[PDB]
Each structure stands twice: as structure tokens, then as C-alpha cells.
Design a protein around this nucleic acid. Structure first.
Length: 1001
RNA sequence: AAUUUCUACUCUUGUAGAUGUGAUAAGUG
DNA sequence: GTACCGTATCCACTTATCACTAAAAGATCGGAAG
DNA sequence: CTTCCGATCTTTTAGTGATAAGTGGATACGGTAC
């Protein structure tokens, strides 16, 4: 079985680091001599003022292209109706596939190969699609072929100013591909049309024909609304709410008119429906019993309805890669000198660029240590960059069937037959070695043969290519044993990455600095100062562990390319910022796989793991409870004071910039929760925020702040390092703890994310930690006098107890259903004890009155806040002896107080009832916060948190945290009884109540 | 109150935690 | 005192996507042959 | 003088896997009103 230390190196995680750059020597002076910063600022300004223009080009082509759509939609309507009726995974896959083919069909409309258009117009659209993601956007063929857009002379000079520099737009270029892609991404126009916008129109047409079949008299009414605004006058109303009209409403203008016809501007259709409903006649009732509103349609994509400068040093792809081959054109290098780190940027020389090419020197010689970065990039995107997909081999193979020998950039000629090009290009979307072919066709032996041939071919290429022939590949498994090539690529990719270090003479370096031929900066933060004394930052730990020698021996933290430079005009003077991304757990796979299943397997193998419940308290900001497998608690904690600094005492006296203090407080408490997590080897539970909205008195009140606190808790638990831990130890810098799955979205992540669970919010604070009893009555229904008589007659019997002086009330769940909430308990009979108010002492001998309650005062039928204390037994005996009832007999007092039917007596009696079943009682003026249950348990004692017993929660905050931990225990027990290593993805209040009452009574 | 950046302090010209950046688009209150 | 109806959120905040790239391929310029 | 050749710098370009899967709703001070 696995251990808790086994949850490391599961999947990669990409992070980034930020540093300041301190100029070295005359370097800044040379920059101040050369004036690159003003030109880079002008380049950035021109880019940001040219972005709307190129955006306008994109909008014009998008509208001009999608105005010609001639596709029908009834088949995908039938598919989505079938999935709505059935929710079958076969119907789910069919719906996904049919949406995908519709997206590809309108993509062929976009890229000009659809059969519905003329092949000349198709070729024109194909040329435009090829042009729109290339350098010919800048004073090239695109603007001439699409003459619909006029450009002023200033705007042509602005477009010309980026000559030979389109790579600066290149990432944005790829971003526009995300607009025009068809791979189900939410930014894509095909996903907006096929998957997002269409179901709203389908629902609108369905509810319209339902309304028409219900009553047709509004139909002509709709017609004059269509004549009120004068929109779509060439067509009728029922033609608009039909499938062939969805061949219109693709441009943003048509969507705008369709939305404004419903919303008005001047009467609209929705307000016409509102006046029809407000008539409250029979037709209003039959349309109020049906969905009587139309949802609007979403707006189309990219259509209208201290700052810093990016630095490039007039040299594109600056720090795009660290490789020595691309060191010539990227110009970014690193040096290490007695613990300090330096960044070298060689700018382009006068006219042409001249390389520097420092020679190696002896290690014993004084000077810097230049790093050498050998990195063949990802095999998927690199192996077909050479061999097949070379223009020469594709042309030759289009002409001949003979295998071709290539020798350029090879240490030995490599042969490629037609078979390998057929596996990599089978003219179909699923390639023969690809898993989609095995999924669709099921030919597993042909899949195995194609995989073996491809694996042998890429092994031969890795042996023959000049960048990779030096690298040893003996660690690879034999070819026929790989079950899929994704695992092979994840295995092969770490073997193609190496970092060396070679000493460079100091004199050459600072001579290059002295002439200005090499620019040198020092990577710097607080921790690299000479007065550094304490524990360093986490990013400093990653940066140090990146260049540690045993990390160079085996790379667990990988240095990425794509580094950026910024200039900020701390803020006393201008500063240079350097941003660099890194990848941690590089030896592991790129994506998590069955992470929750692995966590449940460990949890089933380790039933003794504790549970930490997290709760938002009223007095304490965040409360912590740690309990065992049997539900007995181990630790209660209030996190108001973190590192001997109270935080409530800052919030209260500063509330009379809150958000940044809240962020800082959550950042401090995240270290505490992760310390308890790693100390107890346990699981943690948080409340599910989307299933409740409470805590108007808790300092952490907003949904947003707790929601993003869970965001950073998930991010922190995704990869976890500790400053005290050694680097090679599990939990260290190069072996971080991975315990939670990657965040995708709060709606799609479910309830369990690794070792972190989620629990529905209510019925956690105001509930007995000994009996699980809760108040069953909604009290907004208790207003009228006969209503409170039915409230009184719903109870069984009440009688004084002579022995201990308390009162005994009985209730059963089969009665008083008119005022009872719809959540019955596990047992059918509850016994309320009205405890006599007597003085007792807690575990430390603090005097306290048992059974005391506090209720708010009411003035002008409204609360005022002066939260006033009362003694429920004293008021009960006061109103009891108000009219003189004998009670020492122990008889049923309820019909004796019921027969007189005094309205004031029933009012104060139900007020006393509200007093006694008020679960928690907390007043901030005197600081009381306590839980007092008017129900005795099986042992025979009613719970009261004023006793300060360490077996039970101190406070209602701790009570809620304990009950959240108990809900996590319920989820864990449901996991133990389950066999699929999954969960129910949610628990109801009734099952939770029944569970806690069965296992606690 | 000194920070790649943020929060909280000043035993220490500093300290304790957190810290994926850049770009784009959409939705909501 | 029992229905009951609407107000306070208006610039910010939250969800999706992708790049984390050497090297081929193509444009560009300076020098030599008819 | 005009044209064809190789160095040199900018762009673009290759593409793997593997399931989640369909998941439920929810008002609140407060004030004014018959």
C-alpha cells in the first residue's frame, strides 16, 4: 500500500518568478547613451493603439464571413432534445460529436472549403484565412484583397512602423486563433454559435410555440410589437422564432435587434408580457402557470455593443529561449558568481549583429560561470518538425513512392519510407498510432503495429539527429512494451533537457561590459541583500533549488523559456523587472490522471486519518477543529491571532483598504492550515460556498473573499514546499507535496479535490454536538393568534419535575406539520427539557447561571439591537403563577394554560418557546458566545458549552467547525462503504441529520 | 517602516508567511 | 398588527483559453559574372 | 550597368492523452399601510 509521502511527483505544475534587475557598471549608462527605452515605450504605445485597428479587421472579416451561413439546425435540435430527455452517456457522446461536426462545418465556412459555397469564393476565403495569421497583415495582401476597410495615412504609417517585427504580435496572433478555432473552447466563435447561443434560441422558440398553443391572442399582439419597434419587418413573428431564422442572427447587429425587440427601448415584448400577467385575469393565470419570459441572446465575440513597458531592445524573440543554438538570436544568458546571479543581454550591433561567443576557461580561474542550456523541445511538436512535414519529403512523396534519405543537419543519413508518412498523415483526423483510431475503430493489432513502427522510427531519429545523438537513450523501455505513446512522450521529454556550467574569465566579461557590447544585470530581491539574516522566501527557494547540483544531476525543477523584461518609470526611481517561468515536478506527467481515485484508495487503505474542519466564526475570524476517525475531537483553535498578532483587533478598530488586509490575513492563516495538514497527515474540509449564503456577522462575510481563499488554498496545496525541510526530502524544494487536483472552475470541480473535501453549509452551527437536535419550526409563519393556538395544540404534554425543579416537554414528528420545517429527524419523539436556572461552575470554577438566554428587543415591530438577557424558567413560572396554576402535582400544564385562551398568555408563551429553542446565544457587548441545548442526551445531561469541557466545543464557532468535520466524516464513511472509490457529490440535510442522530443517539 | 509584489511588524540597513506572469475574450452583480 | 413589496451595488469581479520554442523556411542584402 | 549567387535575419511551425459528465437552488431591511 501507499504512504502519505507517496503523494509527490504526480504531475507537472507551471509557476513563474519575478525579480528586480540591478544594472552592473556602465550598462545603464550605455542604455542611457543608446536610448532604447524610449523606442521600446513608443513601440508598446503603437502596439496598444494598433490593437483596436487589427481587431476591426478581424471583426470585418468575421461578419463578412458569417453573413453567408446556409446550414440547417433541426438535427442538432433533435440531438439536444434526446439528451435532455434521456441524459444517457451515449446520447451525450452523440450530442458532443454532432456539435463538433457543426463546429467544423462552420469552420469550413470560415476557412473556405465548404461544399455549399463556390470554389472560387472558397479559395478566396482560404487565402484570407491563411493570410490572417501571418506577417502579411502589415501593409500586405490582406488589406488589398478585403477592400471593405478604409485606412487613413496615419494608420498606414502606424502599421508600417512594425516592419520586420511582427513576432512582437505573435502571441496575440495565436490568441486570435482561439477566436477562430473550432475545438470546443469558450472563446471560439463556433462554440458560441453551436453550443452557447443556439440553446437559448431553441428554448425561446419552444416556449413561444407552447404559449401560442396555450393562447393565440397575444400573437397578433406580438406582431404590433414588431410594428412598434419596426424590426424584422420583412418576416413574420412565428417565422422569427423558427429554425430557418437561426440562419440569420449571426452578426452582432442582428443579435442586438433580437435582444432589443424583447427588451424594448418604447414598448418591448417582455413588458407586454408583464402587463398581460398583471391583468390577473384567466389568461394571465394560464400564462403565469407556464414559462412566460424569453431569455436574451449573448453578444457576439470581439464586437462592439504603476504602469510598465515591455522591453525588446529592438530585437524580436528576446529571451524566448535559453538554448545555446538560439543564444545567438535570443541573446539572454545567465551567470552564477559566488552565490549571486546575473543576466546578460547582448544587443544588436551597428547595422548587422555581431556575436560574442565566450570561450570556456578553467574552473579554478576567477570569473563567472555561464550556464549552458541543451533543450530539444517537446517531442510532439519537434519530431514532425523534422523528418516528415519537411517540404522536401512531402513534395518527393507526392511525386514518388521511393523512400527518401535525408542528411542535412544529421550525423548520419536517415531513411523514411512511405509507410511512416502514411502513419503520420493518413488523410484522416485519427492517426494510426493515435488513440482516437483505437477508440473509433477498435483495431488494436494495427494500433500496436503502427505504434511499434512509429516508436522505432523516432528512436532511429533520436539516435541520428545531431542535437540528440549525444544524448543517451538507454533508459527507455523496449519498443513493443509501451501501451500508449502519450506515456512514452512523457517519459522521453525529460531526457532531452540538460544544464551545464562553465567558468568564464572575469576580464573578458567586464571588457564586454566596458565597451557596451554586453549588457549585464544582477537578478535581485530582498533575500540577496548583504544584510539578509533570516529564512528566505519561497521563490528564492525555487531559484536556489533550480541551480542546485543534484538538481543538475536529475532535473526535478525545469527552467522554462519565454522570459519577459519590463521597465517601470521602491517607486522613487525607475526599475527593471525580470519575469521568468519555471516548471516543477518536470519528471512527472503533464496532466493529472485519476487523482481523486488515488486519494480515495489511500483513504480506504488508511482509515485512521484525522479530519480538520474549517469554519467561519462570529468572534474568531476562522476556527479550526481536528477530530479522529471515531469523531472524538483532538484540537480546537481560533486563528484570530497568527504569529502573536491578533487580527480581529485590527479589523474592528480600522473599520470605523479592508480587502488587502483580508488578503493578508488569509495568506497568514494558509501557513497554519498547511502546517496542521502536514502534521496530522489528514484530510481537510471546507464549506461548499455555492450551496449557501449565511454569516452576515462573521468578519469574513462576503462570498468572494472566502471563495478566493479556497482558490489560494487549492493553489498552495497543488504543489507544496516547506522552508525548514531539506531539499531532497519529500516535501522539500525538488520533491514537493501534491495533494489537490488542479483548479479548473468552481462549478466543474465537484466536491472532492484530492485531500480537500466540501460540505453543504447549513445545519452545522446551531445543532447539538451530543444529540444532534435542531429547532424544527420556521418562525415567519407564526404571526396570527389562532395560528399560535394551533402551535400550542401541536405539542404533546408539559409537566413540572418535582425532583430537580425543571420542566419536561414532549413532542413527536408526526404532529404540528403546519409549522414544522420539511426535514424530519431520525427518531420520531423529541424530549425538550426546560432546565431550571441554577448557578454552576465550569472546569476552572468560573461562576455561571445555567439555562440563561438572550433575545433581541423589538420596537415598532422592528429590531433595534439592544440584545437583552432573560431567564426562561423564571418567566415561565412568572406567567404560570400570573393566573395561579398548581404545578407541584406534576400534571399536564398544557391544557390548563390552553383552556383560558388568553391571547397575551399565548404570545408570551410562544416567546418563551422561542427563547428556549434559540440554539446559540451570543452578545458582543458583554462578550458571551455559547451553546445551550434544552434536550438531555442518552447519559441524561443537557449540553451546555459554558462548562468549558475539552471533550466538546468551547464555542458555537467550534461547534460549527466540529459539525463540518462530522460531515466530512460522513463523506468518508460513505467512501468506505462504497466500492467505486467515488462519492455522492453532495449530501442532503435529511440524510446528514439522520446520520448524526443515529450515530450520536 | 525598509519588500519582485502583497499583508503584518521593526531584535536585526531588516523579520514571518503568501506570491503564474503576459495577452485576449465573454458573463455577472 | 397583518400582508406585502422593493431596494442598496453604477467599476469591479469572476470565468474561460493559450505561450512558456528550436529550427525550418522564407525574406533581404551585398558581392561577383556577362 | 544588370543579374544571379550565397550569408544573415525574421517568421512560423510542428501537435500527444485522457475523463471528468451532466450537477440545485436562493433572498432581505424596512417601511409603510389598510
Amino acid at each position: 500500500m501507499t504512504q502519505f509521502e507517496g503523494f509527490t511527483n504526480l504531475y507537472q505544475v507551471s509557476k513563474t518568478l519575478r525579480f528586480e534587475l540591478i544594472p552592473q557598471g556602465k550598462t545603464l549608462k550605455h542604455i542611457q547613451e543608446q536610448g532604447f527605452i524610449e523606442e521600446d515605450k513608443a513601440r508598446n504605445d503603437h502596439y496598444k493603439e494598433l490593437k483596436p485597428i487589427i481587431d476591426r479587421i478581424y471583426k470585418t472579416y468575421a461578419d463578412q464571413c458569417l453573413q453567408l451561413v446556409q446550414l440547417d439546425w433541426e438535427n442538432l435540435s433533435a440531438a439536444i432534445d434526446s439528451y435532455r430527455k434521456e441524459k444517457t452517456e451515449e446520447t451525450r457522446n452523440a450530442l458532443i460529436e454532432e456539435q463538433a461536426t457543426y463546429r467544423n462545418a462552420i469552420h469550413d465556412y470560415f476557412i473556405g472549403r465548404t461544399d455549399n459555397l463556390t470554389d472560387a469564393i472558397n479559395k478566396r476565403h482560404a487565402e484570407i484565412y491563411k493570410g490572417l495569421f501571418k506577417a502579411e497583415l502589415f501593409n500586405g495582401k490582406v488589406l488589398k484583397q478585403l477592400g471593405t476597410v478604409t485606412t487613413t495615412e496615419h494608420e498606414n504609417a502606424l502599421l508600417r512602423s512594425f516592419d520586420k517585427f511582427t513576432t512582437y504580435f505573435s502571441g496575440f496572433y495565436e490568441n486570435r486563433k482561439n477566436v477562430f478555432s473550432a475545438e470546443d473552447i469558450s472563446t471560439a466563435i463556433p462554440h458560441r454559435i453551436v453550443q452557447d447561443n443556439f440553446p437559448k434560441f431553441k428554448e425561446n422558440c419552444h416556449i413561444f410555440t407552447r404559449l401560442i398553443t396555450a393562447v393565440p391572442s397575444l400573437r397578433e399582439h406580438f406582431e404590433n410589437v414588431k410594428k412598434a419597434i419596426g424590426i424584422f419587418v420583412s418576416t413574420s413573428i412565428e417565422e422569427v422564432f423558427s429554425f430557418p431564422f437561426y440562419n440569420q442572427l449571426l452578426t452582432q447587429t442582428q443579435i442586438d435587434l433580437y435582444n432589443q425587440l424583447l427588451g424594448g427601448i418604447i414598448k418591448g415584448l417582455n413588458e407586454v408580457l408583464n402587463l398581460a400577467i398583471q391583468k390577473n385575469d384567466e389568461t394571465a393565470h394560464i400564462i403565469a402557470s407556464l414559462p412566460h419570459r424569453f431569455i436574451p441572446l449573448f453578444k457576439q465575440i470581439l464586437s462592439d455593443r504603476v504602469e510598465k513597458f515591455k522591453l525588446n531592445f529592438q530585437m524580436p524573440t528576446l529571451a524566448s529561449g535559453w538554448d545555446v543554438n538560439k543564444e545567438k538570436n535570443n541573446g539572454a544568458i545567465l551567470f552564477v558568481k559566488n552565490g549571486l546571479y546575473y543576466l546578460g543581454i547582448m544587443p544588436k550591433q551597428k547595422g548587422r549583429y555581431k556575436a560574442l561567443s565566450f570561450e570556456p576557461t578553467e574552473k579554478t580561474s576567477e570569473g563567472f560561470d555561464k550556464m549552458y542550456y541543451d533543450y530539444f523541445p517537446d517531442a510532439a511538436k519537434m519530431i514532425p518538425k523534422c523528418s516528415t512535414q519537411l517540404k522536401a519529403v512531402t513534395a518527393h512523396f507526392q511525386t514518388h513512392t521511393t523512400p527518401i534519405l535525408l542528411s542535412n543537419n544529421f550525423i548520419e543519413p536517415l531513411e523514411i519510407t512511405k509507410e511512416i508518412y502514411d502513419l503520420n498523415n493518413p488523410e484522416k483526423e485519427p492517426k494510426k498510432f493515435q488513440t482516437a483510431y483505437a477508440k473509433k475503430t477498435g483495431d488494436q493489432k494495427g494500433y500496436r503495429e503502427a505504434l511499434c513502427k512509429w516508436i522505432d522510427f523516432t528512436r532511429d531519429f533520436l539516435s541520428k539527429y545531431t542535437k540528440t545523438t549525444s544524448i543517451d537513450l538507454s533508459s527507455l523501455r523496449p519498443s513493443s512494451q509501451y501501451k500508449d505513446l502519450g506515456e512514452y512522450y512523457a517519459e522521453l521529454n525529460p531526457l532531452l533537457y540538460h544544464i551545464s556550467f562553465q567558468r568564464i574569465a572575469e576580464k573578458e566579461i567586464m571588457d564586454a561590459v566596458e565597451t557596451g557590447k554586453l549588457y549585464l544585470f544582477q537578478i535581485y530581491n530582498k533575500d540577496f541583500a548583504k544584510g539578509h539574516h533570516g529564512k528566505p522566501n519561497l521563490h528564492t527557494l525555487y531559484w536556489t533549488g533550480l541551480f542546485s547540483p543534484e538538481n543538475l544531476a536529475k532535473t526535478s525543477i525545469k527552467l522554462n523559456g519565454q522570459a519577459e523584461l519590463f521597465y517601470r518609470p521602491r517607486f522613487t526611481s525607475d526599475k527593471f523587472f525580470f519575469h521568468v517561468p519555471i516548471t516543477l515536478n518536470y519528471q512527472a506527467a503533464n496532466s493529472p490522471s485519476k487523482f481523486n481515485q488515488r486519494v480515495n484508495a489511500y483513504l480506504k487503505e488508511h482509515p485512521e486519518t484525522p479530519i480538520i474542519g474549517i469554519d467561519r466564526g462570529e468572534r474568531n475570524l476562522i476556527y479550526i477543529t481536528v477530530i479522529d476517525s471515531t469523531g472524538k475531537i483532538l484540537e480546537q483553535r481560533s486563528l484570530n491571532t497568527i504569529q502573536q498578532f491578533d487580527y480581529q483587533k485590527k479589523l474592528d478598530n480600522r473599520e470605523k483598504t479592508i480587502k488587502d488586509l483580508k488578503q493578508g490575513y488569509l495568506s497568514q492563516v494558509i501557513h497554519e492550515i498547511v502546517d496542521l495538514m502536514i502534521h496530522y497527515q489528514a484530510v481537510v474540509v471546507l464549506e461548499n460556498l455555492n450551496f449557501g449564503f449565511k454569516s452576515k456577522r462573521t468578519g469574513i462575510a462576503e462570498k468572494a473573499v472566502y471563495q478566493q481563499f479556497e482558490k489560494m488554498l487549492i493553489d498552495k496545496l497543488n504543489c507544496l514546499v516547506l522552508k525548514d525541510y531539506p531539499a531532497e526530502k519529500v516535501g522539500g524544494v525538488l520533491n514537493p507535496y501534491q495533494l489537490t487536483d488542479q483548479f479548473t472552475s468552481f462549478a466543474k470541480m465537484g466536491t472532492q479535490s484530492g485531500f480537500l473535501f466540501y460540505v453543504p453549509a447549513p445545519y452545522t452551527s446551531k445543532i447539538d454536538p451530543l444529540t444532534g437536535f435542531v429547532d424544527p419550526f420556521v418562525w415567519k409563519t407564526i404571526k396570527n393568534h389562532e395560528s399560535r393556538k394551533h402551535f400550542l395544540e401541536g405539542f404533546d404534554f408539559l409537566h413540572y419535575d418535582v425532583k430537580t425543579g425543571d420542566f419536561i416537554l414532549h413532542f413527536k414528528m408526526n404532529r404540528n406539520l403546519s409549522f414544522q420545517r420539511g426535514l424530519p429527524g431520525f427518531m420520531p419523539a423529541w424530549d425538550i427539557v426546560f432546565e431550571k436556572n441554577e448557578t454552576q461552575f465550569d472546569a476552572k470554577g468560573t461562576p455561571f447561571i445555567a439555562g440563561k438566554r438572550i433575545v433581541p428587543v423589538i420596537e415598532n415591530h422592528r429590531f433595534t439591537g439592544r440584545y437583552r438577557d432573560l431567564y426562561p424558567a423564571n418567566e415561565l413560572i412568572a406567567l404560570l403563577e400570573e393566573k395561579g396554576i398548581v404545578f407541584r402535582d406534576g400534571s399536564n400544564i398544557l391544557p390548563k394554560l390552553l383552556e383560558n385562551d388568553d391571547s397575551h398568555a399565548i404570545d408570551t408563551m410562544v416567546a418563551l418557546i422561542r427563547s428556549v429553542l434559540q440554539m446559540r446565544n451570543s452578545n458582543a457587548a458583554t462578550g458571551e458566545d455559547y451553546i445551550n441545548s434544552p434536550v438531555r442526551d442518552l447519559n441524561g445531561v443537557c449540553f451546555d458549552s459554558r462548562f468549558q469541557n475539552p471533550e466538546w466545543p468551547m464555542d458555537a464557532d467550534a461547534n460549527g467547525a466540529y459539525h463540518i468535520a462530522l460531515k466530512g466524516q460522513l463523506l468518508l464513511n460513505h467512501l468506505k462503504e462504497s466500492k467505486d472509490l467515488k462519492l455522492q457529490n453532495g449530501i442532503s440535510n435529511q440524510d446528514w441529520l439522520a446520520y448524526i442522530q443515529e450515530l450520536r443517539n
